[PDB]
Write a protein that binds this ligand. Structure first.
Ligand code: CL
Ligand code: ZN
Lengths: 149, 149, 149
């Protein structure tokens, strides 16, 4: 009953790709809440086994050179730690930036989500490429999950 | 029990950004339904307090000049009115249009969603920039929410 | 109780648009599961009437000619078969590829979802344009649904 979380920006050998986001708001601060989940070191930690819809939005935003190709791969990864040594990729979503040499800025919000079976004490996190391009405004970048059954 | 809505196109001082969409289908017309929510002046009005997953898809579609820079910021905003004087932004998602001078058209569907705690009589709405570029086909542009717990 | 599905890549006259994806993983293989739904010929088949949140992510990925305009419309369609002769489009989401002649590749993950009333024995499927550009990695392309009430 009321197993859900929404957390926001604050304004066997295989390694996870990208860079893990660990600056999600860890305080009860309004759009961010936790209910029968908790947050530790940027990971949502599961208390109740079941099917969870898991989602994240990550806002890539940047301002934009002769002989300088500047293509960007903006990728969001959602990973799980369970009782296995390596993190397990659940979902990935990607964009490329505009290739035009006239490009002066880029706005690329990436949303994805999906339903996964999770066990008690599993840990879920978001990682991204180009993390220095992420805008952590609390309405633009966020991560959440809820128990569907 | 059965607290959900999906509504579609028809084919303290701070102000909300963008332009509010108020032309969502207000009739029971098949993909659009309301269940223990209602629609008034383009806003979904909450009857039962709780956690809601709220989402919207807004389709920007357009056809595409010397010395004319024509960059577009296409942004979708999801706002809440509660017992506070100003609307409160919950979520924003943005794209820029292709900067190439060879661009002849643009197709930019923007989806986002997330879980928020809502109170009885809160009102939620969608606003967009460039509203004249939105394609209100009922399968392309829509707004919904459901009680997660 | 536990009516949900997530299926992934494996690594009256009117016709449905695009090409139907029928290569979703049909085995219980970990991120893919079925619970009180089944999969037949690429379609999720409903066992219990009710409101379903339905979603899909489809990853378009490609490498990129004089006098060759190469614009791509990448569209994802989610269709329903019910007790009617023609499939019924529920949701569509579209992108265009970058128009720059400097474009060397394209990464376009498309996610959409929404809530629809479904009947027992309704069938839901995903179709896409440019199907030869879809990357069926199981973390990148997927289709799912869950009963919201
Ligand atoms: Cl572009
Ligand atoms: Zn471009």
């Amino acid at each position: 009953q009321r197993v859900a979380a929404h957390i926001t920006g604050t304004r066997k050998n295989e390694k996870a790709l990208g860079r893990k986001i660990n600056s999600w708001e860890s305080s009860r601060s309004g759009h961010s809440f936790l209910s029968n989940l908790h947050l530790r070191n940027g990971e949502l930690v599961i208390h109740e086994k079941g099917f969870y819809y898991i989602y994240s939005q990550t806002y890539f935003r940047f301002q934009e050179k002769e002989n300088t190709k500047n293509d960007k791969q903006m990728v969001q990864y959602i990973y799980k730690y369970t009782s296995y040594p390596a993190p397990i990729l659940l979902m990935k979503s990607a964009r490329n930036s505009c290739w035009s040499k006239d490009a002066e800025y880029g706005l690329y919000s990436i949303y994805q989500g999906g339903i996964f079976e999770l066990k008690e004490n599993d840990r879920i996190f978001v990682s991204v490429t180009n993390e220095h391009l992420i805008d952590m405004d609390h309405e633009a970048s966020f991560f959440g999950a809820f128990l569907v059954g």
